[PDB]
Amino acid sequence: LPNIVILATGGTIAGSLGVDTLINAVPEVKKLANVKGEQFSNMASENMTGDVVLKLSQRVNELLARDDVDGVVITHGTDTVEESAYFLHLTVKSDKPVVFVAAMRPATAISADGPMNLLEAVRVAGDKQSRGRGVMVVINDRIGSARYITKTNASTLDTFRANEEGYLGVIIGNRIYYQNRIDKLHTTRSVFDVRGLTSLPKVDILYGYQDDPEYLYDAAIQHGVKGIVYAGMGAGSVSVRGIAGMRKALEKGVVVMRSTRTGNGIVPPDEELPGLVSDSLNPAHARILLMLALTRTSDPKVIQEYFHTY
Amino acid sequence: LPNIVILATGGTIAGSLGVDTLINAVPEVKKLANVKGEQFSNMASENMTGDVVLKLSQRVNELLARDDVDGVVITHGTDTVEESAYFLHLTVKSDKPVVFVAAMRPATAISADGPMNLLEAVRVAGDKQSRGRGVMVVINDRIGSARYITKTNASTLDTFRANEEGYLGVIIGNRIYYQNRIDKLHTTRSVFDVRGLTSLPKVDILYGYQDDPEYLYDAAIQHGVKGIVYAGMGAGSVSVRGIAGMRKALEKGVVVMRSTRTGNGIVPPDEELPGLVSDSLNPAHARILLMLALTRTSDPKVIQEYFHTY
Amino acid sequence: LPNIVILATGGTIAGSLGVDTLINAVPEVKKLANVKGEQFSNMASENMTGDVVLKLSQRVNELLARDDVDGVVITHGTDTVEESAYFLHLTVKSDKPVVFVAAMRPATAISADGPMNLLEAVRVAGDKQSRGRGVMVVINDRIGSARYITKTNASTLDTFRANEEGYLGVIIGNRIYYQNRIDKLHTTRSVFDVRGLTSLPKVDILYGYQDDPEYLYDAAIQHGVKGIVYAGMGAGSVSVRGIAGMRKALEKGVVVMRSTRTGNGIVPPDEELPGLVSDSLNPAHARILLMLALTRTSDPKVIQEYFHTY
Amino acid sequence: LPNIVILATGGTIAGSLGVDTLINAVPEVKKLANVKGEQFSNMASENMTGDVVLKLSQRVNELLARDDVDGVVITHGTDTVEESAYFLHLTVKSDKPVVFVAAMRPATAISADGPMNLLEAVRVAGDKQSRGRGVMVVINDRIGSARYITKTNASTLDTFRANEEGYLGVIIGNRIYYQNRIDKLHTTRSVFDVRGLTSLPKVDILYGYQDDPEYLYDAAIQHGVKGIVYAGMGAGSVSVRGIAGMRKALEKGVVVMRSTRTGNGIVPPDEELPGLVSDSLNPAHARILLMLALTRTSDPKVIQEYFHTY
């Protein structure tokens, strides 16, 4: 049996202490692997901070470096699991399976989804075929790449999707079907190393819409953000106001990253406009990447290249 | 043949002034109806402003009250057309068709989509079956409701979609197939009358995400916003910093609307959280409804109901 | 509280007879209404037959004509529920809610979806706002119209979808949100009355695909089918072999309905091809409408209109 | 510049002789590569036969074996392009790009899509990064794997999709963005060799629905089909009739493959039922694979393994 450690970052996703009420809630899990529960942190994912995500990443790198650990499963709130997951997707230097699992319904609710999600997560974490596939998010019978997956619906069980990238694999009838391998850098082939890191750069996200305010750029600049991700209109389009706001930020050495608020797609290069473009990274993902990029360089050209390859 | 007035708000979406380059680029349109072209404004949809959308709404109410006008087609940029169309969805007091048409590829590009989207738009605007359906957005053989449709992809022609609500109808083989009638208030049954208004209450949208800063709330507040739409994590989840920013906003007379960044779904009521909830209006749609709501009242009970019924 | 009759057609979708295991498995249901359980039939939906669906339709018309019955919930297998539900969509002459509920995971499975789907189904059936919406299929927090909904995936819980038409509504946080009203004929406004019928005209579905054989047409014909629904390539495209098979069918009194295997969309009229076109009814829905149509007439002009209006 | 040969299998997809009217319709193509037009065959894809697909596969293998050919582009009707493409996906022993391209609108129609599709196809065919990605189908800015892509809508421009597998890459702003590499065997790592093959086994497809006829199995058996692909209900579910029909076929040495009519998903193994299961192959794909499998063996276990790895 695989040795899999399950790290909890909040309350239980299955069962009625903490990561243990969970490990007991689903017995069948002990047939897939010899599990070990660890309550790494404990809060609503909307309260998950880069500092904790950074600790989580270091903890997991540490665990995976040992031979008595075959893979890691992380229970996490669904709201920002995509942010936390993409962070480790870029900072865990191991081919060992790293699976984030979440639930849309409380563990006490009727037809709660946590129990089946955990089981699937553990199955995927211990399966030999799961190696070297980057960080994954398992829920609702699907396996999504941390780089593509995102919560697309506020409240439905099937919320996680990668509309244009699809899923890596699915788990049907207790069998894992692997469909794709993502064509991007990650985990073992990533330049973002978190060994010795203590904090991350400040990157805020500004929305683009009709009449968007130029003053929020100022506020961001005045609070010393090292980077600004712009959840732009359409393909990162910027209004005159947003442009004056970006030009201003670019003078102060702030890195401007143009993404989209649409939800999917490529924000293509465009020299007529300020900042860099996010490729197919959505705002939440673009922010995690922009931060890690800055722990390496401030060179606009190198960062752009990261965004086209990570 | 129907009398359709084509209103342009930017450059031409068909052909190589402006609204006439457009009307002559697709002669086939003169077969579906008698068209008159009016260049209402001229700028990229990312620079379209509430003040102008306001004038558009009045210009459209004015045209539709005329016996020699059976419907209106409005060419608009794809980036914010959902904002503008929804604005008119709530303010045009007529059952005559109001069809916004856009184009994802430049008029002079290879396989430009504008010619066809315009033809379908005119056909929809002139069809007698199109009456009383609310404002529509026509593009890529589909007819979406202004209340549900949104640009889901940055650069694809099939970008417009209402994942959970579908399309009101479609146009295949030069024929309109009507599938749905939205079960919401709009146009002739809407209480929002902006006849005479010059400016609308200021509403900003703040993003929800790990480490989101309280200071962005302080900034919007200090600049006099009257309402803040929150593109929250998951179902309008708020961090301790966003909650503090929301309470500060409430203590300063700013109305708070909790939406979601996910892109789809329902943000449910939560007695344990501050502010109102957006039902299924995404951030961009929510901002439009809240602005209009604030010209009428600041009563949270009343505004909440608007968001459950419009 | 509403009076809801739960009709079972197979085993229980909730709990560990049959319809009572079900009603006692989800006590919360007794809170939404007063339920009476009736085991109508008992077999897997892949073995559900037109003759039984016919009896179900009459049993449902019978119950709904009673003042002590406010609505009906019908448990059914997921495999052919779209066929059965659409049958009742066209034959139940009542505005009272008729909600089919299914479950993708066995009742005793980990994270079984039946308990919740049943609760939502009962809530939808009993809500006063649910009247006059046509037959509904409730599962996975969604309410799809019997006319558009279809099982799009073999094994996932989110299998039910109407890609182009969306859901009539959804159930989030124990609340129903109604998004659409289908713009089609059904129930109280349907001409299809099957009161008293025992058997329906025989209709087969033949697939369209490279090298498809003419002999399958000969076979259906020789066995006395009255109608052939063609799950064609693309927009009901036919090969020279399928055309020959269709002409043979026409020369033998079999009505030909051209649909599509793609899974979505409109099959448009084509004067240059044989047979009728299915509008946007998929093969399985088309078969149901054609059978019912044939109990009324064989007039192609009339049947074509049914397919554009039901 | 890459040397790319464009093989036409029908009329032109762009422009107003044959593959030449097409090569002239889009000049920009000559900037991406030194192209050579060849009219391989000439008919409506719904009339495409395995014999021709087999010739096409041999022709392309022959072309790719030369150094003066860098990649191949095949214009094809949209109705069965997925069948033809999957065939070469399994029989072209080269890492050289093989791109199938199609158009949904006639080349003379307004906003015809062929011109942009061709250009994108050629770009993808000549780009060095496109090597070893299996056969691809380019249309509507998307790059889909022949193994996953399918026509999901009868008439819309965005019809091609792999709902659960997503696209391999997309082409936005004249730049190719590669997202996934499929995790299946194909082209250079495929055991299906067509060198010397003259014909393919007979495989027909039978639909599964309420009241499905057992006689079509007999008809298929009596016409000597070597294989039967079953577009089953839900997850390849079989009614009593279909089971008697399969048992009958299994006695006569016919290979029974259970797929689904739903459109997506896994048909899982199930020993309680007859035949083999198609994994995530849809009927059209399962038929192409079943035929090629039979040109190698009739062993039920080896064929099943093919279906879980190809």
SS3 letters across chain D:
CCEEEEEECCCCCCCCCCHHHHHHHCCCHHHHCEEEEEECCCCCHHHCCHHHHHHHHHHHHHHHCCCCCCEEEEECCCCCHHHHHHHHHHHCCCCCCEEEECCCCCCCCCCCCHHHHHHHHHHHHHCHHHCCCCCEEEECCEEEECCCCEECCCCCCCCEECCCCCCCEEEECCEEEECEEECCCCHHHCCCCCCCCCCCCCEEEEECCCCCCCHHHHHHHHCCCCEEEEEEECCCECCHHHHHHHHHHHHCCCEEEEEECCCECCECCCCCCCCEECECCCHHHHHHHHHHHHCCCCCHHHHHHHHCCC
Q: Which two tokens stand for residue D19?
A: 């593959």
Rounded CA-CA distance C37/C42 in Å is 14
Q: CB-based contacts of B138: which residues, under 8 Å, 6+ apart? A: B99, B100, B101, B117, B120, B121, B124, B144, B171
Rounded CA-CA distance B10/B7 in Å is 9
Residues of A in contact with D162 (CB under 8 A): 166
Minimal CA separation from D50 to chain B, in Å? 30
The total number of residues written for chain D in this structure: 310
- Phi and psi (nearest 5°) for B60? -70, -45
Neighbours, chain C (3 or more CB pairs < 8 A): A, B, D
Instruction: Label the pairing between strands D71-75 and D98-101.
Output: parallel
Instruction: Label the pairing between strands A160-161 and B169-172.
Output: unpaired
Nearest CA in chain C to B168: C165
CB C87 within 8 A of CB C58: no
Rounded CA-CA distance A95/A131 in Å is 5
Backbone discontinuities in chain D, residue before each (C to N > 2.5 A): 16
Minimal CA separation from C81 to chain D, in Å? 10
- Torsion angle of the four alpha carbons C267, C271, C273, C277, in this order, in degrees rounded to the nearest 10: 30
Look at A155 and C140 and tell me if their CB atoms are within 8 Å: no
Among B213, B263, B215, B216, residue whose Cα is nearest residue B239? B213
Rounded CA-CA distance D105/D239 in Å is 40
Look at A154 and B234 and tell me if their CB atoms are within 8 Å: yes
Q: Which residue has the tokens 């026409």?
A: C250
Identify residue B1 by its one-letter amino acid code: L
B34 and B148 fall within a common domain: yes
Q: How was this structure determined?
A: X-ray
Q: CB-based contacts of B152: which residues, under 8 Å, 6+ apart? A: A163, A262, A263, A264, B159, B160, B161, B163, B263
- Phi and psi (nearest 5°) for B170? -145, 165
Among C107, C175, C186, residue whose Cα is nearest residue C141? C175
Exposed e or buried b per residue across A238-247, where buried means at least 16 C-beta atoms within 10 angstroms of its C-beta: bbebbbebbe
Look at B119 and D141 and tell me if their CB atoms are within 8 Å: no
Q: Is the dihedral of CA D139, D144, D146, D149 positive or negative?
A: negative
Q: Which two tokens stand for residue A149?
A: 């997956």
D261 and D301 fall within a common domain: yes
Instruction: Label the pairing between strands B203-207 and B227-232.
Output: parallel
Q: Which two tokens stand for residue A129?
A: 């075929």
C195 and C90 fall within a common domain: yes
Instruction: Label the pairing between strands D227-232 and D203-207.
Output: parallel
First-to-last CA distance in chain A?
A: 33
CB C90 within 8 A of CB C190: yes
Nearest CA in chain C to D53: C210
**C contact set with B (CB within 8 A):** 142, 148, 162-170, 172-173, 175, 177-184, 265-266, 268-269, 279-280
CB A197: neighbour CB atoms within 10 A? Answer: 15
CB C194 within 8 A of CB C58: yes
Please classify residue D199 by burial: count the beta carbons closer than 10 Å to its beta carbon, then call 0-12 exposed, 13-18 middle and 19+ buried. Answer: exposed
SS3 assignment, position B149: coil
Nearest CA in chain C to D84: C210
- CA A143 to chain CA mean position, Å: 13
Residues of C in contact with B146 (CB under 8 A): none
Q: What is the resolution of this structure in A?
A: 2.2
Residues of C in contact with A30 (CB under 8 A): none
Residues of C in contact with D223 (CB under 8 A): 213, 215
Among C110, D208, D127, C139, residue whose Cα is nearest residue A31? C110
Please give the sequence-ordered ranges of beta strands (E in DSSP) within chain C, or none if there are none.
Answer: 3-8, 34-39, 71-75, 98-101, 136-139, 142-145, 150-151, 160-161, 169-172, 175-178, 180-182, 203-207, 227-232, 255-260, 276-277
Rounded CA-CA distance C187/C135 in Å is 8
Residues of D marked active site are found at 12
Residues of D in contact with A166 (CB under 8 A): 148, 162-167, 180
Exposed e or buried b per residue across D264-279, where buried means at least 16 C-beta atoms within 10 angstroms of its C-beta: bbbbbeeeebbbbbbb
Q: Which domain covers residue D269, as residue numbers?
A: 202-310
Look at B110 and D112 and tell me if their CB atoms are within 8 Å: no
Q: Which two tokens stand for residue A52?
A: 């904790």
Q: CB-based contacts of D184: which residues, under 8 Å, 6+ apart? A: A179, D134, D147, D309, D310
Rounded CA-CA distance A309/B207 in Å is 26
Rounded CA-CA distance B261/B232 in Å is 5
Which run of H or of E encompasses B96? none
- Phi and psi (nearest 5°) for C170? -145, 165
SS3 assignment, position C119: helix
C166 and C22 fall within a common domain: yes
Identify residue B246 by its one-letter amino acid code: M
Rounded CA-CA distance C55/C71 in Å is 18
Rounded CA-CA distance B167/C162 in Å is 10
The total number of residues written for chain B in this structure: 310
Among A209, A259, A213, residue whose Cα is nearest residue B150? A209
Residues of C in contact with B278 (CB under 8 A): none
Look at C113 and A110 and tell me if their CB atoms are within 8 Å: no
- Torsion angle of the four alpha carbons D297, D299, D300, D305, in this order, in degrees rounded to the nearest 10: -60
Identify residue A300 by its one-letter amino acid code: P
- Phi and psi (nearest 5°) for B38? -130, 120
Q: Which two tokens stand for residue D131?
A: 């090597």
Please classify residue D252 by burial: count the beta carbons closer than 10 Å to its beta carbon, then call 0-12 exposed, 13-18 middle and 19+ buried. Answer: exposed
- A20 marked as binding residue: no
Among D255, D144, D262, residue whose Cα is nearest residue D202? D255
- D45 marked as binding residue: yes
Residues of A in contact with B262 (CB under 8 A): 150-154, 159
Look at D49 and C78 and tell me if their CB atoms are within 8 Å: no
CB B2 within 8 A of CB B67: no
CB D283 within 8 A of CB D206: no
A237 and A168 fall within a common domain: no
Instruction: Label the pairing between strands A136-139 and B203-207.
Output: unpaired
Please classify residue C199 by burial: count the beta carbons closer than 10 Å to its beta carbon, then call 0-12 exposed, 13-18 middle and 19+ buried. Answer: exposed
Q: Which two tokens stand for residue A166?
A: 């699809």
Specify the long-range contacts of residues D224-227, CB closer than 8 Å, at least 24 apart.
D225/D254, D226/D201, D226/D202, D226/D254, D226/D255, D226/D294, D227/D201, D227/D202, D227/D203, D227/D254, D227/D255, D227/D256, D227/D257, D227/D287, D227/D290, D227/D291, D227/D294
Rounded CA-CA distance A235/B45 in Å is 12
User: How many domains does chain B contain in total?
Assistant: 2
- Partners of A6 in the β-ladder: A37, A73
SS3 assignment, position B288: helix
A186 and A277 fall within a common domain: no
Look at C155 and D237 and tell me if their CB atoms are within 8 Å: no
Look at A175 and D148 and tell me if their CB atoms are within 8 Å: no
Q: Which two tokens stand for residue A112?
A: 């709660």
Residues of A in contact with B235 (CB under 8 A): 79, 154-155
Minimal CA separation from D295 to chain B, in Å? 40
Q: Which two tokens stand for residue D83?
A: 């069948």
CB D133: neighbour CB atoms within 10 A? Answer: 23
Which run of H or of E encompasses B184? none
Look at A44 and B223 and tell me if their CB atoms are within 8 Å: no
Number of residue pairs across B and C with CB atoms under 8 Å?
Answer: 81
Specify the long-range contacts of residues D295-302, CB closer than 8 Å, at least 24 apart.
D295/D192, D295/D197, D295/D200, D295/D201, D296/D191, D296/D192, D298/D253, D298/D255, D300/D255, D300/D276
C84 and C98 fall within a common domain: yes
Residue D178 Cα distances to A256, B105, D85, D162, angstroms: 24, 22, 19, 15
**Catalytic site includes residue A187:** no
C170 and C224 fall within a common domain: no
Among B138, B260, B164, residue whose Cα is nearest residue B206? B260
Q: What order do you get walking across the sheet with D203-207 strand by strand?
A: D203-207, D227-232, D255-260, D276-277
CATH of the domain at A105: 3.40.50.1170
First-to-last CA distance in chain B?
A: 33
Minimal CA separation from B156 to chain D, in Å? 7
Rounded CA-CA distance C103/C139 in Å is 7
* Helices then strands, each counted (H, E), chain C: 9, 15
Rounded CA-CA distance B146/B138 in Å is 10
Rounded CA-CA distance B10/B86 in Å is 18
Among B130, B120, B226, B217, residue whose Cα is nearest residue B173? B120
Look at B157 and D141 and tell me if their CB atoms are within 8 Å: yes
Q: Which two tokens stand for residue A218?
A: 């100022």
C63 and C76 fall within a common domain: yes
Neighbours, chain D (3 or more CB pairs < 8 A): A, B, C
Look at B110 and D28 and tell me if their CB atoms are within 8 Å: yes
Identify residue D56 by its one-letter amino acid code: L
Q: Which two tokens stand for residue B90?
A: 């709530």
Residue B72 Cα distances to B13, B29, B48, B184, angstroms: 16, 13, 19, 21
Rounded CA-CA distance D77/D44 in Å is 6
Rounded CA-CA distance C264/C152 in Å is 10
Nearest CA in chain D to C262: D152
CB A69 within 8 A of CB A60: no
Rounded CA-CA distance A111/C139 in Å is 12
Minimal CA separation from A72 to chain C, in Å? 22
Rounded CA-CA distance A271/D182 in Å is 34
Q: CB-based contacts of C66: which residues, under 8 Å, 6+ apart? A: none
CB D304 within 8 A of CB D286: no
Rounded CA-CA distance D283/C262 in Å is 11
- Phi and psi (nearest 5°) for C125? -65, -35
CATH of the domain at A215: 3.40.50.40
Look at B115 and D110 and tell me if their CB atoms are within 8 Å: yes
Identify residue B282 by its one-letter amino acid code: N
Rounded CA-CA distance B171/A253 in Å is 50
Minimal CA separation from A116 to chain B, in Å? 21
Minimal CA separation from A250 to chain B, in Å? 19
Rounded CA-CA distance B54/A187 in Å is 51
3-state percent helix, strand, coil for chain B, nearest multiple of 5: 35, 20, 45
Domain end (from C173, C201, C229): C201
Rounded CA-CA distance A75/C30 in Å is 34
- A78 marked as binding residue: yes
Domain end (from B184, B201, B218): B201
CB B178 within 8 A of CB B168: yes
Q: What order do you get walking across the sheet with C34-39 strand by strand?
A: C34-39, C3-8, C71-75, C98-101, C136-139, C142-145, C169-172, C175-178
D49 and D173 fall within a common domain: yes
CB A262 within 8 A of CB B80: no
Residues of C marked active site are found at 12
Q: Which two tokens stand for residue A18?
A: 């903490």
Most distant CA pair in chain B: distance in Å?
60
Residue B251 Cα distances to B219, B255, B274, angstroms: 14, 10, 11
- Torsion angle of the four alpha carbons A94, A20, A139, C44, in this order, in degrees rounded to the nearest 10: 140
Count Cα atoms within 13 angstroms, Cβ side, for D142: 31
B193 and B268 fall within a common domain: no
C244 and C254 fall within a common domain: yes
**D contact set with A (CB within 8 A):** 142, 148, 162-167, 169-170, 172-173, 175, 177-184, 265-266, 268-269, 279-280
- Partners of C143 in the β-ladder: C138, C169
Among D100, D95, D53, D55, residue whose Cα is nearest residue D73? D100
Rounded CA-CA distance B156/B286 in Å is 24
Residue D294 Cα distances to D194, D290, D303, angstroms: 12, 6, 8
Q: Which of B54, B56, B155 to mutate to test the interface with A (most CBs of A within 10 A)?
A: B155
Domain end (from A201, A217, A249): A201
Among B9, B12, B187, B260, the active-site one is: B12
Nearest CA in chain D to A165: D166
Q: What order do you get walking across the sheet with A276-277 strand by strand?
A: A203-207, A227-232, A255-260, A276-277
Considering only CA atoms, give the Rg of chain B. 19
